[PDB]
Amino acid sequence: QAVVTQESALTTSPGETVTLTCRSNIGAVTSSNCANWVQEKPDHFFTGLIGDTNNRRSGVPARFSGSLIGDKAALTITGAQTEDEAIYFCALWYNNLWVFGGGTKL
Amino acid sequence: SVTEHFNVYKATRPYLAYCADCGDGYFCYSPVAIEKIRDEAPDGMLKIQVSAQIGLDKAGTHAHTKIRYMAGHDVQESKRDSLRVYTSAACSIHGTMGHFIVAHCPPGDYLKVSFEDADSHVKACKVQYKHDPLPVGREKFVVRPHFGVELPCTSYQLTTAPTDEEIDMHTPPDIPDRTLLSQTAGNVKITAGGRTIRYNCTCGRDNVGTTSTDKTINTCKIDQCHAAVTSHDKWQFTSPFVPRADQTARRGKVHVPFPLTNVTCRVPLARAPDVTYGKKEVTLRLHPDHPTLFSYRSLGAEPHPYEEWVDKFSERIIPVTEEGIEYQWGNNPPVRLWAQL
Amino acid sequence: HFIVAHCPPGDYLKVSFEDADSHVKACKVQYKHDPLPVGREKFVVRPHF
Amino acid sequence: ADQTARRGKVHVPFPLTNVTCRVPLARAPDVTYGKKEVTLRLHPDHPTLFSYRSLGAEPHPYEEWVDKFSERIIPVTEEGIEYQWGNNPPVRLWAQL
Amino acid sequence: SVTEHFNVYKATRPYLAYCADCGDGYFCYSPVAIEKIRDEAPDGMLKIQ
Amino acid sequence: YKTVVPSPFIKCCGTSECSSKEQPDYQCKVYTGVYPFMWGGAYCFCDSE
Amino acid sequence: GRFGDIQSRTVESKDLYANTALKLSRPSPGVVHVPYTPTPSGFKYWLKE
Amino acid sequence: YEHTATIPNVVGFPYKAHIERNGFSPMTLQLEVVETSWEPTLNLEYITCEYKTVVPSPFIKCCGTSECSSKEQPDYQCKVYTGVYPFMWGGAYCFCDSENTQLSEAYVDRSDVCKHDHASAYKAHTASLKATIRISYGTINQTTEAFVNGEHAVNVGGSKFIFGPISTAWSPFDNKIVVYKDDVYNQDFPPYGSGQPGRFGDIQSRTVESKDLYANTALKLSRPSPGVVHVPYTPTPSGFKYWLKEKGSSLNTKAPFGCKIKTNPVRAMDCAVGSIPVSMDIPDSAFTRVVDAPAVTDLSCQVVVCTHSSDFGGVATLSYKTDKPGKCAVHSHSNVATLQEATVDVKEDGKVTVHFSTASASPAFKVSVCDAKTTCTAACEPPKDHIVPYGAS
């Protein structure tokens, strides 16, 4: 379909607000093209971080907020630590589904 | 009445709707429609009224370059020539008033209207109303460039005809178009977009009801909480191939262009052969011409008439009685053949 | 190496390139391709039949 | 007739499927099934195809292209006639009592 | 099976065929060739080779 | 005469009063089984409804 | 079915009958199908003859 | 036990006869027919559409000789034209092509689209009717599938009606049936290789999966034109297109003796021929005793509506006496008429009310109520109809 070009990870520090973006398919990630980010931890439940690039995920950790920046859509995770060893993803809830790839390794 | 052009055109601006022949073997929501033909001016004044404003700029007035078609995906206000009334032919370009194009055009059964100015690359919607007139006069031609006749007939009206026609809309706009849907799971994240959009859902006053801004609509999501852009801002035509799901039975009335009156026309004057009149005989060497009604009528006698709409250089057998033959054919005058030595 | 679509079904073949496909590029034939319609009625019912 | 047999094999388009076309089914005229006869006064349309079959009986097969409305000879009797005119169901030609 | 356009288009540098009716009656290697017609239609969406 | 055509009544609540309008060309048909699957949802709440 | 279809002794009248066969049809399936196929031209008969 | 009777071969005449025992109480068994495809299983010959000519272009060997070879095609035509100097719009390689020949083989091949272009060349094999017996046996009311010959065992839920023998020795389709798939045009095509020049089946085709075949299309090439070294190819006019030109109408609409056609399993869509017998060996569901069934009596049948007539219409009123109410037989003690109802319910001493339909003039009909028959009347002036669909005459 269309794949957000992947930055190398969402490299985070203690307080390191990882703006893990994906270089979106048409432009900046949006909310009707749905291009927002997620901070996805392990154990097979990928958890939404900032959905549609304008607001956080619904009930996630203390870091997740969506943004559309540069030519990319993603999430900033601020209040993130090393217990979120996961993928930092930017993908589209684009009105025919929610579809992210793996992104980078956050 | 209807005697003002501008607002009576531009109140309910045109709506491109579902025409059943738009493509190769299927129709679509065609930008230009072809509603109904007004053809009673006997020179072939086919005034096709369809879903575009016939000769109207999209901001309302008589824009000479602008042909105004509109959709909820917006007004294609495009060039004049991209409509072609391909009536078995090219465009038979006469004029266009109101919501109709009035054309004197050549014969052909599979008529088409094509749209190319800002409503599409092109759109072709056809009608079988075969424009073969059979005009006035006996003759077998339509002769404008020679003054063979000025035959009395119908001048289909091309003036500022404001109020003989009434373009209507009752049960105002009813058709399916719900293209303002957005993505959600259970509280649906829709935005502003698509049309005059309400929801028809199992929850919400905007999930089942009017969405007019950004919304997260509850009790009805995508999958079975639908929406719809209904036709508003006008009483659009009747929409045929449309529904009365727009159940607001109301009134929208506007003019229609140019009803017909009396007028002369160019015609094929009578071509006569050489009548072999002899001492007991009458024959006529009629040469071949356009296929013309020769009417060798009984002149005062028992009128068992020789009729013919004939295109052959034949013999018009004039049996001349004491009563004389009444021989008039093809829109020429008659002849009173008194037969005597 | 083909082109597929409808036409006025008849006997006079021609195919045209325009934008440098000719001044007008119309290679033709006597291309007999008859209507042969399905159904006893001899029309093509386009938008409702 | 280049003398080197060296070829190129490409595909071809258009696999045939039964497309559902808008058929010719128009309204037929007044059935003048006479008290000892049959006829069908039909209107004109696009150039039609009517059908008479000797329905039940010896098969008088008839049909027609159409360009003007005509009264067709319905074989009137209790033994039936076989009509079917332009994309519709037939007529079992039976006179009553 | 030809479900990708790539090599079947990358092979074909084509040539103009001998056409004895392109214009008035003029005949030469016209650059768009009319090889055949194909009847693939119930109605005649014809596919010319 | 000329036949105006009314909108085919988007039968929500299932049925409705199909009403004879007192015209000699005023003829109504409440077309039941009426699942008009238009692109913007039914006025008809059920499909058969 | 012939001339004199829209019958009106008031020929300028609004009180006036008909004799015409406005054959309305059942709806076409998913889009609006308006099966009103009326009888032909009684004016088309009288001026066609 | 076994009630062996006849029945019609048109649809819709639901026969109802009371099969009772000699003292065993009468039970009204009946059935009507449902669609009865006669299904001619015929032996198909050639199934080719008239295909396209795979023709080889002329080797104008200039400065040399030319060697045409064997065709290996059913339209194998090798046009040699020596002295071929085709100085075209860039030129032949040997300009003096007097020692240069323009030759080329050819082969008219079948359609690749003959998966719609084909016809079974059906020589006349056997056939047999297709029964869906809408039986009302007592109140067991079902429909049962069967083949319509007099050899099946008509087992349906306790009731074995062998559907009767061949009451109608017709065939809708003749001994040669060009079944061009959606239409058995009753046309004797020639043999597999019986080819006529450009005739219906000039594209000869042996097996539809098989490759070889006959062929008689006049593949006549010409030795080519002056400067353009022309393919002079001329086949016969296309017998696929010619057979499409002779594509006939609905032959079932011309198949008389009341025929309807039926596609691929090519059956008799309302094959209105003959009369369908029925050997109804019935099981024992209806045997009441000498105090067993409703004790009906006093069959005072009066045709209280007049028999002209149309569909049934004879307004039977049998004011009948009884021990209690019941569902008495309506099974006909008038075999000329068609009495409409079969198990007519009865409050005692009341009018059994039905319609019975036949052309009686100055007889009436005796009518078979649950015990016996009684003479309802008729009419001596005829009916008032002019046209209707169909009925029970």
Coordinates of N, CA, C and O in Angstrom, one line a residue, chain H residues 121-167:
Chain H
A121 N -22.2 -31.3 -31.4 CA -22.8 -31.7 -32.7 C -23.7 -32.9 -32.3 O -23.4 -34.0 -32.7
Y122 N -24.8 -32.7 -31.6 CA -25.5 -33.8 -30.9 C -26.3 -34.6 -31.9 O -27.3 -34.2 -32.5
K123 N -25.8 -35.8 -32.2 CA -26.6 -36.9 -32.7 C -27.6 -37.4 -31.6 O -27.2 -37.3 -30.4
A124 N -28.7 -37.8 -32.0 CA -29.9 -38.0 -31.2 C -29.7 -39.2 -30.3 O -30.0 -40.3 -30.6
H125 N -29.3 -38.9 -29.0 CA -29.3 -39.9 -28.0 C -30.7 -40.0 -27.3 O -31.6 -39.4 -27.8
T126 N -30.7 -40.6 -26.1 CA -32.0 -40.8 -25.5 C -32.3 -39.5 -24.7 O -31.6 -38.5 -24.7
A127 N -33.4 -39.6 -23.9 CA -33.8 -38.5 -23.1 C -34.8 -39.0 -22.0 O -35.2 -40.2 -22.1
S128 N -35.2 -38.2 -21.1 CA -36.2 -38.6 -20.0 C -36.6 -37.4 -19.2 O -35.7 -36.6 -18.9
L129 N -37.9 -37.3 -18.8 CA -38.5 -36.2 -18.2 C -37.9 -35.9 -16.8 O -37.2 -36.8 -16.2
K130 N -38.1 -34.7 -16.3 CA -37.6 -34.3 -15.0 C -38.7 -33.9 -14.1 O -39.3 -32.9 -14.3
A131 N -39.0 -34.8 -13.1 CA -40.2 -34.6 -12.3 C -39.9 -34.1 -10.9 O -38.9 -34.5 -10.3
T132 N -40.7 -33.1 -10.5 CA -40.8 -32.6 -9.1 C -42.3 -32.8 -8.7 O -43.1 -32.0 -9.1
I133 N -42.6 -33.9 -8.1 CA -44.0 -34.3 -7.9 C -44.5 -33.5 -6.7 O -44.0 -33.8 -5.5
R134 N -45.3 -32.6 -6.9 CA -46.0 -31.9 -5.8 C -47.2 -32.7 -5.5 O -48.3 -32.5 -6.0
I135 N -47.0 -33.7 -4.6 CA -48.0 -34.6 -4.1 C -48.6 -34.1 -2.8 O -47.9 -33.5 -2.0
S136 N -49.9 -34.3 -2.7 CA -50.7 -34.2 -1.5 C -51.2 -35.6 -1.3 O -52.3 -35.9 -1.9
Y137 N -50.5 -36.4 -0.5 CA -50.9 -37.7 -0.2 C -51.5 -37.7 1.2 O -50.7 -37.6 2.2
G138 N -52.8 -37.7 1.3 CA -53.5 -37.3 2.5 C -53.2 -35.9 2.8 O -53.7 -35.0 2.1
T139 N -52.4 -35.6 3.8 CA -51.8 -34.3 4.1 C -50.3 -34.3 4.0 O -49.7 -33.2 4.4
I140 N -49.7 -35.4 3.7 CA -48.3 -35.3 3.3 C -48.1 -34.6 2.0 O -48.4 -35.1 0.9
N141 N -47.7 -33.3 2.1 CA -47.6 -32.5 0.9 C -46.2 -32.1 0.7 O -45.6 -31.3 1.4
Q142 N -45.6 -32.7 -0.4 CA -44.2 -32.5 -0.7 C -44.0 -32.5 -2.2 O -44.9 -32.6 -2.9
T143 N -42.7 -32.3 -2.6 CA -42.3 -32.3 -4.0 C -41.1 -33.3 -4.1 O -40.2 -33.2 -3.3
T144 N -41.2 -34.2 -5.0 CA -40.2 -35.3 -5.1 C -39.5 -35.3 -6.4 O -40.2 -35.3 -7.5
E145 N -38.2 -35.4 -6.5 CA -37.4 -35.4 -7.7 C -37.5 -36.8 -8.3 O -37.6 -37.8 -7.6
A146 N -37.4 -36.8 -9.6 CA -37.4 -38.1 -10.3 C -37.0 -37.9 -11.8 O -37.1 -36.8 -12.3
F147 N -36.5 -39.0 -12.4 CA -36.4 -39.1 -13.9 C -37.8 -39.6 -14.4 O -38.4 -40.4 -13.8
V148 N -38.2 -39.0 -15.6 CA -39.6 -39.1 -16.0 C -39.9 -40.3 -16.8 O -41.0 -40.3 -17.5
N149 N -39.1 -41.3 -16.8 CA -39.5 -42.5 -17.6 C -40.3 -43.4 -16.7 O -40.4 -43.2 -15.5
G150 N -40.8 -44.4 -17.3 CA -41.5 -45.5 -16.6 C -40.6 -46.6 -16.1 O -40.9 -47.8 -16.2
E151 N -39.5 -46.2 -15.5 CA -38.6 -47.2 -14.9 C -38.1 -46.8 -13.5 O -37.5 -47.6 -12.9
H152 N -38.3 -45.5 -13.1 CA -37.9 -45.1 -11.8 C -38.8 -45.7 -10.7 O -40.0 -46.1 -11.0
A153 N -38.4 -45.7 -9.5 CA -39.2 -46.1 -8.4 C -39.5 -44.9 -7.6 O -38.6 -44.3 -6.9
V154 N -40.8 -44.5 -7.6 CA -41.1 -43.1 -7.1 C -41.3 -43.2 -5.6 O -42.4 -43.0 -5.1
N155 N -40.2 -43.3 -4.8 CA -40.3 -43.4 -3.4 C -40.3 -42.0 -2.8 O -39.3 -41.3 -2.9
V156 N -41.3 -41.6 -2.1 CA -41.4 -40.4 -1.4 C -42.2 -40.6 -0.1 O -43.4 -40.7 -0.1
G157 N -41.4 -40.7 1.0 CA -41.9 -40.7 2.3 C -43.0 -41.7 2.7 O -43.8 -41.4 3.5
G158 N -43.0 -42.9 2.0 CA -44.0 -43.9 2.3 C -44.8 -44.1 1.1 O -45.7 -45.0 1.1
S159 N -44.7 -43.3 0.1 CA -45.5 -43.5 -1.1 C -44.7 -43.6 -2.3 O -44.0 -42.7 -2.7
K160 N -44.8 -44.8 -3.0 CA -44.0 -45.1 -4.1 C -44.8 -45.0 -5.4 O -45.5 -46.0 -5.7
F161 N -44.8 -43.9 -6.0 CA -45.3 -43.7 -7.4 C -44.1 -43.8 -8.3 O -43.2 -42.9 -8.2
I162 N -44.0 -44.9 -9.0 CA -43.3 -44.9 -10.2 C -44.0 -44.0 -11.2 O -45.2 -44.2 -11.5
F163 N -43.3 -42.9 -11.5 CA -43.8 -42.0 -12.6 C -43.9 -42.8 -13.9 O -43.0 -43.6 -14.2
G164 N -45.0 -42.6 -14.6 CA -45.5 -43.5 -15.6 C -44.7 -43.6 -16.8 O -43.6 -42.9 -17.0
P165 N -45.1 -44.5 -17.8 CA -44.3 -44.7 -19.0 C -44.3 -43.5 -20.0 O -44.9 -42.5 -19.7
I166 N -43.7 -43.7 -21.1 CA -43.5 -42.6 -22.1 C -44.9 -42.4 -22.7 O -45.2 -43.0 -23.8
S167 N -45.6 -41.5 -22.2 CA -46.9 -41.0 -22.7 C -46.8 -40.1 -23.9 O -47.8 -39.9 -24.6

